[PDB]
Amino acid sequence: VDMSKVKLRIENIVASVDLFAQLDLEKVLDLCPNSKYNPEEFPGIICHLDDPKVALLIFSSGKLVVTGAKSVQDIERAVAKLAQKLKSIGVKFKRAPQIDVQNMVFSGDIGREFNLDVVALTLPNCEYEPEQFPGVIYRVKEPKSVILLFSSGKIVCSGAKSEADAWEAVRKLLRELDKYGLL
Amino acid sequence: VDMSKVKLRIENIVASVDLFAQLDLEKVLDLCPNSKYNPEEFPGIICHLDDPKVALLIFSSGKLVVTGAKSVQDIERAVAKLAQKLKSIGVKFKRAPQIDVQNMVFSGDIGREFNLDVVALTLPNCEYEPEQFPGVIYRVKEPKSVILLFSSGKIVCSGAKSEADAWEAVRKLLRELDKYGLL
């Protein structure tokens, strides 16, 4: 495999956060501009931070989800800025926030165009039903991740909680494509 | 609303073709510049034409699948190219080849980054399972198409069989995003 043209760029990081502090979403709403709380729509509230541009799915449990983050820094700055705002309304947290990367999505380009039908016909563990979903879905077992391969050669890797794992996932795909004379 | 920043480019056109003449794939194989033929796994010959660079999945029924085409011209030429090759091996064709565009995949960009978690919580009907598949799936009923939206704003429209329908699909996606204040 010629990794030289393979690019992978973090597109998004979603982190599961635990503030360890039950929250009164009705109050939390105050901290979130234009945020609305409709429990019959979504049990939490979508808190939009402008800096970093992130949206937090804040739950009453104090557990939240940092979404729309481009970096681990966004997540950190977000959880912090949030907890700041929370104390600014009287929240005292039982513990330190348990921040965990839930998922990372990397968009990429493996370097070359592919005939998805051929890849799908050739490649053993891949899914391909273009009408229903564009691209060839390649699910990696280790690490658990999924690569969406497009005929353009652009790929989108998700499921991985680290860039290294994403890269390995991409490496495994290329390896598999290679193994099946698809590169 | 604003289609000025929406870029859509054909990525693939797949056509179903019925040469209406039974093909002896054993003989057909020599017609292919390159072919993958493993009858045991896949019944059709994976016929790689250099020009157009397209792969025809040639079945003995005379039905083909033109894959990896980026234009209707490619499709047309590949089918005529195969047809002529088949003629050169005594394949006579009673009927006119029936070529039907089965799918077009357009890659694109709607010119706005998105928070798919929010989009997904917000859009009335889209699919979003990032650990299972990257991007948000937005299915259009009319025209029946599927747009996969990425946080980058990059989209991949599939299912349409017309570029106009793809654009209209993308338009519907946008009109929807707009309706939900996601634009």
Secondary structure (H, E, C), chain B:
CCCCCCEEEEEEEEEEEECCCCCCHHHHHHHCCEEECCCCCCCCEEEEECCCCEEEEECCCCEEEEEEECCHHHHHHHHHHHHHHHHCCCCCCCCCCEEEEEEEEEEEECCCCCCHHHHHHHCCCCECCCCCCCCEEEEECCCCEEEEECCCCEEEEEEECCHHHHHHHHHHHHHHHHHCCCC
The H helix count followed by the E strand count for chain A is: 4, 9
Distance CA A173, CA A175 (A): 5
| Interruption sites in chain B after residues (C→N beyond 2.5 Å) | none
The dihedral sign for the CA sequence B1, B2, B3, B7: negative
Helix (H, G, I), strand (E, B) or coil at A106: strand
Three-class secondary structure of residue A28 per DSSP? helix
A129: exposed, middle or buried (Cβ count in 10 Å: 0-12, 13-18, 19+) = exposed
Q: Give the whole-angstrom CA distance, residue B168 versus residue B170.
A: 5
With a CB cutoff of 8 Å and minimum separation 6, the contacts of B89 are: B27, B28, B30, B31
- Cα–Cα–Cα angle for B50, B52, B55, rounded to 5 degrees: 70
Both B171 and B118 in one domain: the answer is yes
Domains held by chain B: number:
2
Do B81 and B108 fall within a single domain?
A: no
CATH code for position B150: 3.30.310.10
Residues of chain A found within 8 Å of residue B151, distances taken between Cβ atoms: 11-12, 68, 105
Find the residue in B nearest to A159 (Cα).
B131
Same structural domain, A80 and A146: no
Which of A101, A132, A164 is a domain's end point? A101
Same domain, A130 and A53: no
CB contact under 8 A, A131 and B159: yes
Q: Residue A150's closest CA among B144, B15, B9, B160? A: B9
Burial track B49-77 (b if 16+ CB lie within 10 A, e otherwise): beebebbbbbbeebbbbbbbbbebebbbb
Looking at the fold, whether A96 and A21 belong to one and the same domain comes out as yes
In sequence order, the 6+-apart residues with CB closer than 8 A to the CB of A128 are A116, A117, A119, A120, A135, A136, A137
Method of structure determination: X-ray
CA-to-CA distance for A158 and A181, rounded, in angstroms?
25
A172 shares a domain with A132? yes
Residues written for chain B: 183
Residues B102, B16: contact at Cβ < 8 Å?
A: yes
Task: Find chain B residues with C-beta within 8 A of A151's C-beta.
Answer: 11-12, 68, 105
CA distance A48 to chain B (A): 9
Strand partners, A154: A109
A94 and A139 both lie in a single domain: no
Q: A22 and A86 in one domain?
A: yes
Q: Of the candidates A63, A60, A48, A56, which has an alpha carbon nearest to the alpha carbon of residue A23? A: A60
Please indicate whether, in this complex, the C-beta atoms of A46 and B133 are within 8 angstroms of each other. no
Helix (H) or strand (E) holding A121: helix A116-122
Of A53, A151, A155, which to mutate for an interface test with B (greatest number of B Cβ within 10 Å)?
A: A151
Query: Do B140 and B179 have their domain in common?
Result: yes
Measured between beta carbons, the chain B residues lying within 8 angstroms of A118 are 36, 46, 48, 55, 67-68
Do A118 and B42 make contact, defined as CB atoms within 8 angstroms? no
The closest alpha carbon to A171, from A130, A142, A128, belongs to A142
How far apart are the C-alpha atoms of B128 and B121, rounded to whole Å? 9
- The encoded tokens of residue B32 equal 């292919």
Mapping DSSP to helix (H, G, I), strand (E, B) and coil, where does residue A85 land?
helix
Are residues B25 and B56 located together in one domain of the fold?
Answer: yes
Non-local CB neighbours of A90 within 8 Å, separated by 6+ positions: A27
Question: Which of B132, B133, B140 is the best residue to mutate to test the A interface, defined by the most A CB atoms within 10 Å of its own CB?
Answer: B133
Q: A19 is in which domain, residue-wise?
A: 15-101
Assess whether B114 and B93 both reside in one domain.
no
- Same domain assignment for residues A124 and A54: no
State the nearest Cα–Cα gap between A88 and chain B, in angstroms.
Answer: 25
Q: Kindly list the distances between the CA atom of residue A6 and the CA atoms of A9, A123, A168, B129, in Å, as whole numbers in the listed order.
A: 10, 19, 12, 25
Three-state secondary-structure class, residue A51:
coil
**Cβ–Cβ under 8 Å, residues B138 and B126:** yes
Q: Which residues of A touch B (CB under 8 A)?
A: 11-12, 14, 42, 46, 48, 53-55, 57, 65, 67-68, 103, 105, 107, 115-118, 121-122, 130-135, 137, 144, 146, 148, 150-152, 154, 156-159
Q: In chain B, which residues have their Cβ closer than 8 Å to the Cβ of A54? A: 115
Residue with tokens 């970096």, as numbered in its chain = A71
Residue where a domain stops, chosen among A84, A101, A118? A101
CB pair distance less than 8 Å for B148 and A157: no
